[PDB]
Amino acid sequence: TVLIHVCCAPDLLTTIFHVRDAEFFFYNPNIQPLSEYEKRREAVDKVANHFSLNVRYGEYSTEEIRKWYTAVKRCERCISFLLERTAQEARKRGHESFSTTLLASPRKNLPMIENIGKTIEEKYGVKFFFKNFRKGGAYQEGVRLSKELGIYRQNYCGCV
Numbered sequence: 001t002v003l004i005h006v007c008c009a010p011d012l013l014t015t016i017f018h019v020r021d022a023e024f025f026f027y028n029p030n031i032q033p034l035s036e037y038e039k040r041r042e043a044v045d046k047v048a049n050h051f052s053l054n055v056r057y058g059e060y061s062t063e064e065i066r067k068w069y070t071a072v073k074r075c076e077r078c079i080s081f082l083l084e085r086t087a088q089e090a091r092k093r094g095h096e097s098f099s100t101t102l103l104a105s106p107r108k109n110l111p112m113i114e115n116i117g118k119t120i121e122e123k124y125g126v127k128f129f130f131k132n133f134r135k136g137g138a139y140q141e142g143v144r145l146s147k148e149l150g151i152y153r154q155n156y157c158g159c160v
């Protein structure tokens with residue numbers, strides 16, 4: 001079983017075209033202010049209820065945001081912070097692998113994410129699952145499903 005960090009609903013939609021049995025982990029203290037975190041969270045919840053996904057919602061609090069701010073090249077930091085928490089959760093909950101929907105994400109740097117994931121794997125002993133999540137047309141498939149579900153598609157990465 002694989003625990004997949006979720007950044008946003010559009011990238012979750014792309015991802016679920018190809019992953020069959022996952023637990024998802026919405027953890028993003030980088031997203032501010034609270035109204036934007038909640039907007040993104042509610043869109044993920046809408047996708048999860050539509051497709052009966054198993055999503056867990058991580059901590060979002062003043063403290064959690066301070067931990068992230070202390071951590072943040074800055075995107076390398078940010079992504080490593082999110083995936084470290086994910087791999088910690090994967091070990092706690094007995095998942096032998098972890099991944100992230102950031103791999104679906106058209107803007108992001110696939111080599112940098114795979115490098116971070118492999119480094120975190122070596123630290124925690126949870127296998128990092130890499131996939132070209134946009135491949136298989138899945139990306140345009142995620143767009144079509146976003147439109148259909150009327151899913152919030154954001155306009156910036158999340159942080160201030």
Ligand code: SF4
Nearest residue numbers: 030074075078157159
């Ligand atoms: S742009 Fe995105 S990846 Fe880079 S620091 Fe901000 S939230 Fe993190």
Ligand SMILES: [Cl-]
Nearest residue numbers: 007008105157
């Ligand atoms: Cl994103």
Ligand SMILES: [Zn+2]
Nearest residue numbers: 007008011105
């Ligand atoms: Zn995303």
